[PDB]
Design an enzyme around this catalytic site. Structure first.
Site, short mmCIF file in Angstrom:
data_model
loop_
_atom_site.label_atom_id
_atom_site.label_comp_id
_atom_site.label_asym_id
_atom_site.label_seq_id
_atom_site.Cartn_x
_atom_site.Cartn_y
_atom_site.Cartn_z
N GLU A 51 -7.26 -0.01 -4.53
CA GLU A 51 -6.92 0.14 -3.06
C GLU A 51 -8.37 -0.35 -2.63
O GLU A 51 -8.47 -1.30 -1.67
CB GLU A 51 -6.89 1.64 -2.61
CG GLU A 51 -5.50 1.92 -2.69
CD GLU A 51 -5.04 3.32 -2.68
OE1 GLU A 51 -6.10 4.07 -1.99
OE2 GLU A 51 -3.94 3.75 -2.97
N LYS A 94 2.47 11.20 -4.26
CA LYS A 94 1.29 10.53 -4.86
C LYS A 94 0.09 11.51 -5.64
O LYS A 94 -0.39 10.89 -6.27
CB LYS A 94 0.65 9.54 -3.71
CG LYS A 94 -0.57 8.77 -4.31
CD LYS A 94 -0.78 7.62 -2.95
CE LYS A 94 -1.99 7.01 -3.36
NZ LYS A 94 -2.46 5.98 -2.36
N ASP A 97 -12.83 4.87 3.21
CA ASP A 97 -11.60 4.74 3.43
C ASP A 97 -11.24 6.35 3.85
O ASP A 97 -11.23 7.26 2.88
CB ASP A 97 -10.97 4.51 2.05
CG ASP A 97 -9.23 4.53 2.24
OD1 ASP A 97 -8.71 5.17 3.21
OD2 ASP A 97 -8.64 3.87 1.23
N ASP A 126 0.88 -1.03 -0.06
CA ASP A 126 -0.04 0.07 -0.01
C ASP A 126 0.84 1.06 0.19
O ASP A 126 1.39 1.64 0.85
CB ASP A 126 -0.97 0.00 1.23
CG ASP A 126 -1.55 1.31 1.54
OD1 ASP A 126 -2.01 2.21 0.52
OD2 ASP A 126 -2.43 1.38 2.31
#
Length: 380
Positions: A173, A69, A195, A8
């Site tokens: 994800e 990211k 999330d 991850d």
């Protein structure tokens, strides 16, 4: 293709797991932490990665990179890039239309592509796994947000390639979180992934049938997380300090930073106890700040932010053309989903339905990635 490894690669923290002897093991780093900051720092003599980078961030903010990211696989002139740049302390520049971070390193100006920063984080993840396992790690499954386009996915795979990993697959994800809970094995199933991490909020609705996943909708807030909840506590406790000791810490960035550190830890404690103690020596002008904050006051300070997380849930459902009763499984991902009030609000919205939460929510994505790596190498 080696041991089965899942990674991850998170916007501010990353996590690595391995599937061995029938089960997933999440791997702690050399400081014993089961997640590792997605941070890379450049100093006068060295590059620091992970905890070592994050530990010195307040002392070297303009040369400490995080949130790569949010850049990876984008163009410099992209709206999200230009907006995000206004709130980072490090400089972002253009090279051939791509974003690069600019830092000072060994007394010189250097620039790095986002995939280079992300490769440095993946190298740390690979090293963490090799310390745990012995030998060398060859292959990995790496996860990305469901909304990532092909440029973003390819640049993430390039980060792995530069690291020297055979990237078996880039998977979503939310799909990884569903795999972690065996939801592909448990007809068509509608699954909602909620999330909520330190800095991003993603809601995804997936369908799973005969082991095949389809993303039906996504929603959320790209700048909502745990940091926002902590700041509400900071303001509150800064006012308390001013009331009790007649000193205003607002203008003093070290004192505010120290209070935020203390508040972040207190918030963690409030997910499992009904109160937390703040203990700061010499917060301001030699005055200590020892106090306590209840879970009830924490919830009250964040009332809007917590209830507001239902709006993206409603939107995902609308876009999926689903009624809330048509969701078969709800999965919690991200450290902020440990907050009891957020669980209660979500459960009530879904008419009392139990949530999938038995896997540490900070770890569930890596866990699912490790399961998928095993399947692909034929270790499972």
């Amino acid at each position: 293709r080696g041991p089965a490894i899942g990674i991850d690669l998170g916007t501010t923290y990353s996590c690595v797991g391995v599937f061995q002897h029938g089960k997933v093991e999440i791997i702690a780093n050399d400081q014993g932490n089961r997640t590792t900051p997605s941070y890379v720092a450049f100093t006068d003599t060295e590059r620091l990665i992970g905890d070592a980078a994050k530990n010195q961030v307040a002392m070297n903010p303009t040369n400490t990179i995080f949130d790569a990211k949010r850049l990876i696989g984008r163009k410099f002139e992209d709206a999200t890039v230009q907006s995000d740049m206004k709130h980072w302390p490090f400089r972002v520049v253009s090279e051939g239309g791509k974003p690069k971070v600019q830092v000072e390193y060994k007394g010189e100006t250097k620039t790095f592509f986002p995939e280079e920063i992300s490769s440095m984080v993946l190298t740390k993840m690979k090293e963490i796994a090799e310390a745990y396992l012995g030998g060398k790690v060859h292959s990995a499954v790496i996860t990305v947000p469901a909304y990532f386009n092909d440029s973003q996915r390819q640049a993430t795979k390039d980060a792995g390639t530069i690291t020297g990993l055979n990237v078996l697959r880039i998977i979503n994800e939310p799909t990884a979180a569903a795999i972690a809970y065996g939801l592909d094995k448990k007809g068509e199933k509608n699954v909602l992934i909620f999330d909520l991490g330190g800095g991003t909020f993603d809601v995804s609705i997936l369908t799973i049938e005969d082991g095949i996943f389809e993303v039906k909708s996504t929603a959320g807030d790209t700048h909502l997380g745990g940091e926002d909840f902590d700041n509400r506590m900071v303001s509150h406790l800064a006012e308390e300090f001013k009331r009790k000791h007649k000193k205003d810490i607002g203008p003093n960035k070290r004192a505010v930073r120290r209070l935020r550190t203390a508040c972040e830890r207190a918030k963690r404690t409030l997910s499992s106890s009904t109160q937390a103690s703040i203990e700061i020596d010499s917060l301001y002008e030699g005055v200590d700040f020892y106090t306590s904050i209840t879970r009830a006051r924490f919830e009250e300070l964040n009332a809007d932010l917590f209830r507001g997380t239902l709006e993206p849930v409603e939107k995902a459902l609308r876009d999926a053309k689903l009624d809330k009763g048509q969701i078969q499984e709800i999965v919690l991902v991200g450290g902020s989903t440990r907050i009891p009030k957020i669980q209660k609000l979500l459960q009530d919205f879904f008419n009392g339905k139990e949530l999938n939460k038995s896997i540490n929510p900070d770890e569930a994505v890596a866990y699912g990635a490790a399961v998928q790596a095993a399947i692909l190498i034929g270790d499972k």
